[PDB]
Amino acid sequence: PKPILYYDERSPPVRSCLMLIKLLDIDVELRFVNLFKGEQFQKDFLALNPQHSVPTLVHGDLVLTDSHAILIHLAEKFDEGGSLWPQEHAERMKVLNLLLFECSFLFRRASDFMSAIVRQGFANVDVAHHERKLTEAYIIMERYLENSDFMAGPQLTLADLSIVTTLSTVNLMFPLSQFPRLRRWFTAMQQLDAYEANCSGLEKLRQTMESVGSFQFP
Amino acid sequence: PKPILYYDERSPPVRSCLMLIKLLDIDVELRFVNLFKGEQFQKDFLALNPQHSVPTLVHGDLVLTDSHAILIHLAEKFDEGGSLWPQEHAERMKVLNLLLFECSFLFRRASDFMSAIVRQGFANVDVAHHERKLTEAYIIMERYLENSDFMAGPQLTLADLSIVTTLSTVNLMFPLSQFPRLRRWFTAMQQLDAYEANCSGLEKLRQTMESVGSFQFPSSSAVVT
Ligand SMILES: N[C@@H](CCC(=O)N[C@@H](CS)C(=O)NCC(=O)O)C(=O)O
Ligand SMILES: N[C@@H](CCC(=O)N[C@@H](CS)C(=O)NCC(=O)O)C(=O)O
């Protein structure tokens, strides 16, 4: 059976999977779960993913509940021998390391910020606090890009797909003007054909955040 | 060259790596980084890991800055063909899925709670809020254990090592009375010889948290076997 992707394209991790699907030309059935209607809490979805999170992938009997597992699974099944998920161990571990940085550091801080807006309203968020936390993430990624054109080495990998969507999301609020390597990398990522998969959901997130948070991004 | 682990045993992700190192009898050089003295911001360590986090592994030219990459790398290098990081694709993805649950959900909520204690003092923490967030993680893990004997399947995997350290940390505060599958699984993990690598750092974390947060964990909460 073909993979089924439960998604809300406002989610950056969802968009990372949409980018990989477009890049690899994977035939996938999309199923929309409206997060702002709480549809991730529907009984059948909760039974599928008790974390009530998107993306969720069902591929035969395999149920994956994290974008980084989905990216790795789809690359191993549909891009065997490719460069996105390198076969050499040391290169593959470096890609894994940056996927985990996205999960544990960049997305965590991006999510803390956006969730504060949704829960408290923009006017009640300590913007300077989150600017510091997310600027530290920029500084780190700027250092990652010192030696290489891409996040995990000289070529595009799953790590770039994971990071670029969340970065595009934080960039709605905090510009990359002070980080030349990171701004160069982002501009290059935007020139990928597969980057078109990020556009619609980013804009829908922009609109939804501005309405629910009662503010406007700069 | 032998792996070098930069570590503070009070960190649950560090303890997950320490458990794997003991289980596989890997010879590793330990290099202590005291998180509560701010040694992770020393210029040389920041250059090595700009996320200023432990565990950090240096193995030859490879530098890993996340416990879940370290667990996978060490399993592939010293448990080749083993079952901790299974060779069949679907089983391996399930282990990876639960590793990421620990990183994205359980540890995130456990860290939010402990960080608030250190930053604010326990008396100024919204403990009820964090009890709800961490009880929800308990429910999710109970659901996983209702469908499988261990976290990711019928046998011990890297996912159990990653999750048990953070679970034991959360359970210093919040009891597992209402979670029979979690209690049975946790008791089984505590029977492992490798669990010795979790005991000491858990106790040191308990002492440090009580000191810095000016409070006491409820002694009845922690599951002891
Ligand atoms: N680490 C997870 C993060 C998944 C996640 O948090 N998704 C958010 C949207 S960005 C979500 O589904 N929120 C719904 C909820 O938590 O109830 C991954 O990479 O897939
Ligand atoms: N996802 C990372 C989390 C690492 C982490 O946050 N470690 C904490 C200790 S539990 C740390 O080093 N804190 C020091 C700091 O952030 O300055 C992993 O699994 O290794």
Numbering used by the authors:
A (entry chain BA): 4 to 221
B (entry chain AA): 4 to 228
The authors write:
Here, we report the first crystal structure of an ecdysteroidogenic regulator encoded by the Halloween gene, noppera-bo (nobo). nobo encodes a member of the epsilon class of cytosolic GSH S-transferases (GST, EC 2.5.1.18; hereafter GSTEs). Consistent with the requirement of GSH for GST function, a defect in GSH biosynthesis in D. melanogaster also leads to larval lethality, which is partly rescued by the administration of 20E or cholesterol. These data indicate that the nobo family of GSTs is essential for ecdysteroid biosynthesis by regulating cholesterol trafficking and/or metabolism.
DmNobo D113A lacks the sidechain carboxyl group at position 113 and therefore cannot form a hydrogen bond with EST. The crystal structure of the DmNobo D113A did not show significant structural differences compared with the WT DmNobo (DmNobo WT) protein. In the presence of EST, as expected from the EST-binding to the H-site, the enzymatic activity of DmNobo WT was inhibited with an IC50 value of ∼2.3 μm. In contrast, the enzymatic activity of DmNobo D113A was not inhibited by EST, even at a concentration of 25 μm. These results suggest that Asp-113 is critical for interaction with EST.
